[PDB]
Amino acid sequence: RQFEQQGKSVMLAAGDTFRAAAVEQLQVWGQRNNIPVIAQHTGADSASVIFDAIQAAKARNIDVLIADTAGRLQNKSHLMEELKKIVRVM
RNA sequence: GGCUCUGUUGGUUCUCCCGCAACGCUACUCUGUUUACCAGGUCAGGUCCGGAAGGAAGCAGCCAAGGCAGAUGACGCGUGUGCCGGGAUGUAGCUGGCAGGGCC
Numbered sequence: 001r002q003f004e005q006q007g008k009s010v011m012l013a014a015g016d017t018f019r020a021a022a023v024e025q026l027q028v029w030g031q032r033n034n035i036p037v038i039a040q041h042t043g044a045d046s047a048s049v050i051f052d053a054i055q056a057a058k059a060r061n062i063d064v065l066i067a068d069t070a071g072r073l074q075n076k077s078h079l080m081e082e083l084k085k086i087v088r089v090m
Numbered sequence: 091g092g093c094u095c096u097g098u099u100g101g102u103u104c105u106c107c108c109g110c111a112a113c114g115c116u117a118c119u120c121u122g123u124u125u126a127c128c129a130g131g132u133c134a135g136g137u138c139c140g141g142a143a144g145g146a147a148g149c150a151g152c153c154a155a156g157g158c159a160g161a162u163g164a165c166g167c168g169u170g171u172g173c174c175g176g177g178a179u180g181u182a183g184c185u186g187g188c189a190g191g192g193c194c
């Protein structure tokens with residue numbers, strides 16, 4: 001809504017396929033803002049979803065795209081490598 | 091100014107197979123101690139046979155070994171990691187691009 005206020009078009013992307021009902025939550029937040037939200041399912045690859053979200057945003061000429069991520073502790077290296085994979089794909 | 095679904099293509103999930111790299115799981119054995127005579131070995135002391143030479147049954151101690159524990163390698167069972175790994179397969183499910191219609 002903050003980015004919806006000055007007239008910038010906003011689209012949301014769900015990057016958490018791990019936690020339960022995160023997709024549905026961001027879909028609720030997306031419905032409250034009356035803006036399209038791109039997500040697939042729980043368990044899906046996050047980097048792929050975010051990638052497709054950016055591609056779609058480029059095709060739909062979306063001004064601002066916000067990409068969510070899964071909650072992760074810093075002491076976990078594999079999740080850090082996953083996030084690095086997300087960035088690398090982006 | 092947005093959206094949906096077809097044509098084509100890129101991913102992803104599930105089922106099956108496999109490679110590399112990156113994180114995590116039992117039963118046995120090594121040490122800690124334990125088990126009087128009635129599994130075994132060495133068997134002190136003592137005792138049995140003998141003039142002598144020497145053998146003998148065998149307690150304790152010790153070592154296996156049998157109970158109970160502290161953890162060591164391979165078998166057995168798993169995976170929200172990376173190479174968007176390589177493949178098989180869906181009449182599948184989800185997502186994106188493009189050629190676009192049409193709906194507003």
Ligand code: ALF
Nearest residue numbers: 016019069070071
């Ligand atoms: F949405 Al969360 F940990 F609760 F990423």
